[PDB]
Nucleic acid binder design. Sequence first.
RNA 1: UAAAUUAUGGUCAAUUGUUAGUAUUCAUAUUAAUUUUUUUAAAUGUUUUAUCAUUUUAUAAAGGUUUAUUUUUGAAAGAUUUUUUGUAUAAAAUUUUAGGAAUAGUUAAUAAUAAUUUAUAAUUUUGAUUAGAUUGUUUUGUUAAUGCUAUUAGAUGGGUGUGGAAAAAUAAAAAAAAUAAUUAAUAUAU
Lengths: 107, 390, 254, 406, 51, 107, 94, 219, 219
Amino acid sequence: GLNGCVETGRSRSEVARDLGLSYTRPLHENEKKQLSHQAVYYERLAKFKMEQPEAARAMERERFVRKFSGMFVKMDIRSGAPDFPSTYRRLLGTKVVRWASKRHGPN
Amino acid sequence: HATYGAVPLTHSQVTSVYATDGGKVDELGLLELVEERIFSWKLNKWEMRIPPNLPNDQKELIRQEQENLKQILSEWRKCFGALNADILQISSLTGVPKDVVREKNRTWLQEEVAKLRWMGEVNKAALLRDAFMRLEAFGSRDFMFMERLCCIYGLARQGTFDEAFTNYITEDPVTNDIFVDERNPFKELVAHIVRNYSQIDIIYDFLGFNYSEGYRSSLRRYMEYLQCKTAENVRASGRLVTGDKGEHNILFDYCVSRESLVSGDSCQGIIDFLYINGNDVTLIIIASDNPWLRNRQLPHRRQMEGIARRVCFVLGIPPSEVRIRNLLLPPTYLDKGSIVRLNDIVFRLSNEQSNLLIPWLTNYNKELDPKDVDYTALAKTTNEEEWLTL
Amino acid sequence: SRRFRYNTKFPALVSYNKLPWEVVNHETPQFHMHVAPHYEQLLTLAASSPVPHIIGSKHIDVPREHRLRLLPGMLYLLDGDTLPGEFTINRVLDPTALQYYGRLSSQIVTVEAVRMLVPDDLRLLCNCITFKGPLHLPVAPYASLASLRGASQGGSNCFTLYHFVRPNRPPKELQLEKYYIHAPCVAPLSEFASNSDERGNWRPRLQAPKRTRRATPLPAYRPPQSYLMGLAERLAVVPGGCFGRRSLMWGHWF
Amino acid sequence: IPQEALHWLLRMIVDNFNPQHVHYIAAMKTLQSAGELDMARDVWKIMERQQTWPCTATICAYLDVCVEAGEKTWAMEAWNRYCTELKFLEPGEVDPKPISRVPFSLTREELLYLPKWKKHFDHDPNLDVMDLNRFNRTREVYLRMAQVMLAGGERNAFQHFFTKLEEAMLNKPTPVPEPPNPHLVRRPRWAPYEHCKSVHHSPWRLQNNGRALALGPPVTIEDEMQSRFFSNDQFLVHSVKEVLRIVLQEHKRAHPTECTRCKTEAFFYKTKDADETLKFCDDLIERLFASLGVRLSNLNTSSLLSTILEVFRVVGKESGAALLQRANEFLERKASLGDAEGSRENLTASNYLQVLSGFADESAFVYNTKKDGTCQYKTGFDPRTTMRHLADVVQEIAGNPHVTWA
Amino acid sequence: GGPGSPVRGPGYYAPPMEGEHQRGYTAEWRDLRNPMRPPEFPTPWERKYRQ
Amino acid sequence: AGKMSLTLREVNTLLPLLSRMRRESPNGALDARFDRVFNAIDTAIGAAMRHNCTLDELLDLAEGLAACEMVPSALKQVEMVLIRSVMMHECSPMHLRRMLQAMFTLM
Amino acid sequence: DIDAFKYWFGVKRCRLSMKPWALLAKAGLLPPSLTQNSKIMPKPLFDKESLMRYYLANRKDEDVMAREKYLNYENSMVKTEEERAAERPVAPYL
Amino acid sequence: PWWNFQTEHRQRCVLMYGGARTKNTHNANHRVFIKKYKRNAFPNRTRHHWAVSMTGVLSQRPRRMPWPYDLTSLIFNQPRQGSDKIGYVVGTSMLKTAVVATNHMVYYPKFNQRVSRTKRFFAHDEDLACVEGDLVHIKQCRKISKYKHYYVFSILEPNVEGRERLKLGLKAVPPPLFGYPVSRRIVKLNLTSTEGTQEKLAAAIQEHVQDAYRFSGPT
Amino acid sequence: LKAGLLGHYQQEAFEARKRFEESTTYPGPIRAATPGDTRFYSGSLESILHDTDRHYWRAVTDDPRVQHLIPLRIRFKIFTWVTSGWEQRMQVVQIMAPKDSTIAQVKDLVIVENQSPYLCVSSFHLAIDGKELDPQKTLGEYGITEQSQIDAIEQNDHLLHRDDERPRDWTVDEITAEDVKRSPYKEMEMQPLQNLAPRYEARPKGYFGRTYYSGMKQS
RNA sequence: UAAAUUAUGGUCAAUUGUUAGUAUUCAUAUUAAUUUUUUUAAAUGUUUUAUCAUUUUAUAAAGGUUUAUUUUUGAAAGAUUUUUUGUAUAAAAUUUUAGGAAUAGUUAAUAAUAAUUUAUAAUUUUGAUUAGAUUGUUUUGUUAAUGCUAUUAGAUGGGUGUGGAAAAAUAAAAAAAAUAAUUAAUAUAU
Ligand SMILES: [Mg+2]
Ligand SMILES: [Mg+2]
């Protein structure tokens, strides 16, 4: 389970997944907190949706109003780019003041 | 082809599965028919012949053995094609019928070449002379006969080639009836090989066809068979064979030197067999494929003197007439000269009595491979050595 | 991340059930435009082949809780003008809405009354059409309409169709696609069968008669005198604005 | 044009792709559906020149075009090259084979010391031949080789192949059918935009919709399953049906003037080789009825009866009432061998189609003959009797609601 | 040259290469400037065009 | 297909159903259709041993592995987290009874 | 470029301006264009009765016209029976 | 005659644009630099521009170019450049994301030498098996995150010491004591008692006041 | 990485591998597990409309799609009209039922595969030789084979209300057609595709014109 | 420290100008002058329609400034088939500053379209962000030169959610749905 499949193009993890093998490093407390707290917020948000409908309806309504009335909601090449301050970096000085820098990752 | 559940066969299941009764089976005709069926194939017929449910090392050894069988059959195919081309060329240049070419003479060759040179055709005369010269060495119907028989025995030994010789659609030559033949000449030929040639596994391993275990067990069975026909009163307990005449006729299977030779060790002298014949002592060693281990495999002179002194201590034989000699055998096969030297030195047999005891020894034409020169130098320095007297 | 699971191609769209321009209202004559050709083909099917559950002896008695779930999409014919309970009777008197039963009333049984039944919860319509017998189509003895007294006889001749639909849906809902089996009518072949006495009275025509006179010529073609719209073979107009192919132009002014 | 089906395979090899077996199957089936048999043999020669060993499905797809062309030499070459080692299924063997070839992977050592041509993996179709012969389609081979020997005129080879197929379908178990492959297409999962025009969208005619078929079928279907999903006795019935279909095909090939709608005088009467042909067909039907006992009561014989009626209509010039009588006698014979009181089945739409086409072949005529306007009919043709036998048959079909007209 | 150019190495001298690049740059790549021999054909199309 | 991953709650819910389908089978073992099911369990267990686990989830996992007779591929991380759960303060004699019965039915 | 022109003309179905059409009609690849007018010969005048009379005077057979269209449009290399008798295998396999 | 590649490129430019190139592009123009700011008062913190700076990515001096002949081209047969890579895992602080440092070669033809530059990529591992210290083989894929378009295809060499340190409850790699500073000013570590922090604060604020007094200049 | 140390590493890649095959002892051939699906396809992101959980090419069919089926044919009592009157006949519906299925599942398979508006008109019940069958029992518990005669006795006073939410061709891989209209055992394996359109290459890569010097094959 | 082996029995050479290609002038060549030449003054008719409307007609310039680039499933091509379905939205890679330090609508996970959560998050001394200069480009020039020196294809998140695609406030043709004209040259001033 340390070698990927050249024929099917599967990863190193997917070959071990199809063999029933477990390759996982011993996690720390924060790495277990990252994987254990995913369900807790879902049960909290579902309990808020079931228990307070008059507030969840207003929150979803204002979220849909903020989503629908936006200026860049049309799917385009600019909206479809993964890194907007890096691909369109000539707008960050004179046109767009949202991003103050053009580099945020290793690219 | 290869099916789920196919297995490679040893000699016992080849003997048991192909055990049919036949009377006056033509060896050469069935051999030529089975080889004509083999040569009519393509390369795609050799693809799916390895059984799937096997470990990878066994599959690799089976693939090497099948590749060896395929290349030897292809070499015999091109040799037979050259033979038929030369016979057709001689029958076309001379004008003699084709079936009487193999019974012709050298005086007849001189007369036909002089007749071609008298008419002014020196090119056709040179072609006829060269075709007859390369036909005298290759033109026999039984030329590689033991090697071809061992190839067909190996094709039966794989176990996946038995159904590849039947269920063909043919035409009758005189009436033009399209039919399907269910006759399997491969099964009849392998049955006749198993019935007549009782030591076909020994010739099969001695020619270097066995890639799995080698020829060492076949060598032990061959030496036990040759001891049982010379001492004639033989007891066999495990790895020790002894004659009970009072005269020392002892064959001791010491160890297998392929696994005994640890790579990276300092231990001088590891032998395979020990044969005490009267007063003579022979250390029968099969050489290794490692050339850095062949110099470590042969024992020292002091070690041979110690072994002879142990023979004097145990057997009670006086040390005045005690001789010990090393014997080196080729690693992957066993050529004709090695078997002749084994019959001369170990069992004290000449050529005529070895041909009387062993019928297939006369047609055994295996020789040393030219690309292994250091083994031939070591065997020349070893086999030409005098008997070490204690 | 969540943005890089799939692309934005083919997003989730609003269905036609919540768009008012895609939903047909039953107070309009457009409701009876979609559903009236489905009735005139079902009565053609029920008069030529036995439809299993198209004719009952009473209204199907589902419970009041299962009334909205099982009834829409169901059709059955009953004898006489008997309406189900817990409905408000609205008779269709609009000639714009009654005009789509013209082929149903002329070539098949005469349409007497079309009623829309709206319940107390206003969620399950019923389109009730009362026909007066007999049929203008020949009815097979093995057909479903042979077991109906109002259809077989030539008050006692009245029979009513009942079709349950949901009020505000697209016209995909009020479709009857399981009744478009085209069963043949053996009325021209019943003359020559063994069951008829007219089987020996017809004379076969194995050869065409010898024509001494040719066909009558058409009258003299007079070209039009008004301004035409142009060549209909390149304005993509069908041969009369009605049917045909533009590549095969015919029936126009030239 | 159908030649593009040969073109896009060739551009597959010019662009350095290895054509899989599904590409050869699709090319041969697309060229066979358009009547291009030589182009299908060119696809087979392309597959042979790529040194690809065909699977059993590619072998069957080649044998279909060897059967339709009537060329026994091509099928004998394909047999002697590939199908000499095909065996039927045994009760001791497992019915599906396990997957033998592990998918291609490289370790941390083999990535380094192996050369780049050993570490290269193209989708070579010769690697998965043992995993494409997993479902034992040998009965579809021995049937096809039984048909082409019928086409070439070899009775002994046909008898050998049919006897082996009959013994295998009587004494060996049924193989597990191969499931259909849904990964061969790139169709969408759902309709992206829901919009459907009505059936009555046009006020001038009834049109077909994408939801429902409202105009009725133009051609009757047999309403049967594929040959791989059949049992062994059902495949024996299908084998007898296919041999009778190839008898019909070779009779139409040998006598094309006497098998189409009239166009000449010779359509009305039987050929001189029709009696031995119908004798061979009757002997095959009686061999099928003698091999299968009461089990033929529990088998679908709709396509078999339709092919029997087509053989005894086209090859033997029989009336439509005789075809209806033969179909009723066949169904009563099938219902009588169950040794119970039973209940007989009806004729299907494909069975009634042969009776109606026999009625149409009775009244058929040579239009506009040499006398300029006189249609020539069959000698002894009675229009009243044929019309009376047509009308009650049409009423019998219309009385049965389970027969869908087309 | 990279994108849209068939040049693979410098004309005369190069930094030290290993493996198949060493065998390619010195022996096996194309060379139309060779006045004695054209760039070679694959096997076996070089034996019959030896003269 | 890698579209979803099972946590320990989904395994503790699926194991009694598969044990019930094993008990309802004519043979003692299940059909070969579910070999991809148990493999999806087999990767879900050995990953969950690297995360946090309460005692009741470990008890339900051990009882589910004992109900339908399946030996997981890891078998050592499960015993390592069962060693850590013996001397806990929340451990009950009912918990030790379930653990010992499950380990005797498995081993 | 003849082959690229035939690829973009037949397979890709390009458009043509009148000056390349006249230039390729000078090469024998195309007929003369629509705009190359002989100003001494006026345009033809069609009437359907004379066209029907000429069509009924000499029209081709149905199968002959179908085989002509098959040779012109579908493929032109259809093997004869003498070549089908050569493409089939021989007695060692037959 | 054997034409070079420039003839083919000129042919491509002629077939595209109708003509190869307009003449007289050199012009020998005297590009003069006119300074505006004061002597050591350029408005930048790192790079102070005082000469004519050339503009160009691949047409500048000294000339660079990518060198495609390296370990990756010797091992992997690639469908395109940068598809398969081999590197080392340096960071696993993110979930399902291994930071992989890989190397490539840049060629200088003037000095005739190749140099190894380093690029860091974000790769994806679902089962969390990549430890810092693994020699891994990553491959290109779809966009997974904003900066994740590679995935760990194989672990060619696992860090055994990192896994054994993770089994001990320690970090896989002990963290470095050196790194990036926070300013150009010398970060002095303050070690004082709890009572002597106010005078140290007074000295620090006085030093900041003198650094602000440096704005005044002379006197 | 340093490429000059590659080939000696290859010797180690030899000297470990030959050390491996002689050290361990292979017990036997492990059975081949079926491969899953990877989420790391090359190129851009696909849509959810075309996500069929298969991003590579597999020419063979594995075990989760293999089903063991029995061709069960079930008879129905129908009535046809003759010149005298009604006559009772038999209409047979053939299904492929799995071997480990129950009789209620066989009834559901008969309901979804009849494709006739005159057969499954009301609630019916399966029986053999008049004796009714328990719908919660397996076919193997009754010894039901292909030759076993199964009848469907109807009760025409009721009305069968079915709700077809399961598609007709539902396998484990969840690839269903919306306009299928046929049982998957009835449809052919390969047919002509009339919905697609044949498209040729219209964008040349490097060759555009007069003289083919190199063709820009590296691109 | 092997100790001069003895027919010396074959000498008669080379050059007939036919070539496996970076070759070097510290003073000569490139730049401006001794010489340049020739014009240009805006204020403007795209067309079909069913007529106060609708159908077709998608990269002008200055400014601001970019490490990089390409391909619509949708319109046409285009066909006696048909679903706004026929894989376009991605990657590697290479910039510069005489007085070199910090950066952020931030990184990954995610039952999360439209993130109320989790994390020991991400970039950077292998040179980041900002400020300056700034289309790039084996197309130019020079030389013996893998050196130095030049460039003018382009693009453009608030003008209108129309349209397949914003590229839309102006371009000697790209002839734009009846052959307007297709002989030739000026093809523009006029
Ligand atoms: Mg279009
Ligand atoms: Mg969280």
